[PDB]
Amino acid sequence: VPDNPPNEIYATAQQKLQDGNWRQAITQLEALDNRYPFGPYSQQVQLDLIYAYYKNADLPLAQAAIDRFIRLNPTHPNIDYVMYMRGLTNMALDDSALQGFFGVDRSDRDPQHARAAFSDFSKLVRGYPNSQYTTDATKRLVFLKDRLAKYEYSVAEYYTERGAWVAVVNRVEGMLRDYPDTQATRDALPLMENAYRQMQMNAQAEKVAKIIAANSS
């Protein structure tokens, strides 16, 4: 945390940012910003510091700084850049871990972060199908969509495993009118039929066997 002129301290912060000394890069970026909340060097400091938070994994610092910034100037050429970074911060908020690294048996945790990323990215890409990150967030979206599908599936599954049938039928209907894309869906459908057998739910089960035959690939 030195007291260099803005150009020199900003350049040192930038080179240690690219360096991977995002820890000390953040140190000197917060130095510069706490020095001056005005000037465009402070605004680019805000951009580089939210990036450096998310890079050095200061996601709480990242989200704080970035919501502060969207409160600062909610309109800018970088709005797509902002909504992008924010959906991503929700993403790493949702599934960054040691098993979040190993990647075995995941996609069923708190989707609050996932709700945030989905809203962010979907409403962004509709507010902005016009960006070089557009299809990236799009993959994030269909990705996370089927991801939360796994979430809710494992859920519903487990549920009927409890011998818990009706609330699951409902959850199904919920995701169904919600989002008919993922395979998890078609997976869930047999289970529905089985539930209908439980209480002997005849006509509807017949209906759904037909309609899965209609959809089932």
């Binding site: 990036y51 989905f118 990150y133 269909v142 969509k145």
Partner: protein, 65 residues
Amino acid sequence: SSDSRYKRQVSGDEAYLEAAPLAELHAPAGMILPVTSGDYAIPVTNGSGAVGKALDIRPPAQPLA
């Protein structure tokens, strides 16, 4: 946060391309169902550009003065 790893790949798997696109339900005659009721709506007009975690994820910088 890295052990000589984790530059152009997310922590763990990426199912971006693996994400199941619309395998539409094709309903029999009169056997239709409300086809959507949530925000899960994408402009199919998108890309094809930065697909998957292999992209220019670094913050777009901005001009100096």
